[PDB]
Amino acid sequence: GAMGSGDTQLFNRAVSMVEKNKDIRSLLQCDDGITGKERLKAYGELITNDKWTRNRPIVSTKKLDKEGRTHHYMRFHVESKKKIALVHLEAKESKQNYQPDFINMYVDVPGEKRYYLIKPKLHPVSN
After folding, report:
1. Structural domain of residue 30, as residue ranges?
2. With the C-alpha atoms ordered 9, 12, 15, 17, is the resulting torsion angle positive or negative?
3. Long-range contacts at 38-42 (CB < 8 A, ≥ 24 apart)
């Protein structure tokens, strides 16, 4: 396990960006010092069903699609200062690149508009 640390890597890489993104932090109510300094947490789908295998734990649904790129569809949940948030990242593995390319990545926070940390190629160049 964890040998395919891509999800593991991406989780940390994805989570770091979302945790530290001001926009997301604002969504996450990440105002440190508001009531002392509060703690954030990040993990895959929590109690969704039973225990660990529930829905989407910290994983990327590895698909080696027609693209010729491994597709990383990864979601994880985080605890904000005041809310519990869900983070969804779509990455693709180039070929021999160190990390997969991030196509899209966004944060789902209850009561907050889904924030797109990373914008997918929504329009084909022209738009």
Report:
1. 1-127
2. negative
3. 38/81, 38/82, 39/79, 39/81, 40/78, 40/79, 40/80, 40/81, 41/78, 41/79, 42/11, 42/15, 42/76, 42/77, 42/78, 42/79, 42/87
**Three-state DSSP class for residue 85:** strand
CATH of the domain at 123: 3.10.450.320
Give the count of domains, the chain: 1
Using what technique was this structure determined? NMR
Q: How far apart are CA 88 and CA 74, in angstroms?
A: 6
Q: How far is Cα 95 from Cα 125, in angstroms, rounded to an integer?
A: 23
Token pair in block for residue 126: 């022209």
**CA distances from residue 78 to 13, 83, 90 in whole angstroms, order as listed:** 14, 8, 17
Structure tokens at 18: 């979302």
Cα–Cα distance, 23 to 126 (Å, whole number): 27
Q: Which of 75, 79, 85 has its CA nearest to residue 110?
A: 85
Q: CA neighbours within 13 Å on the CB side: how many for 44?
A: 18
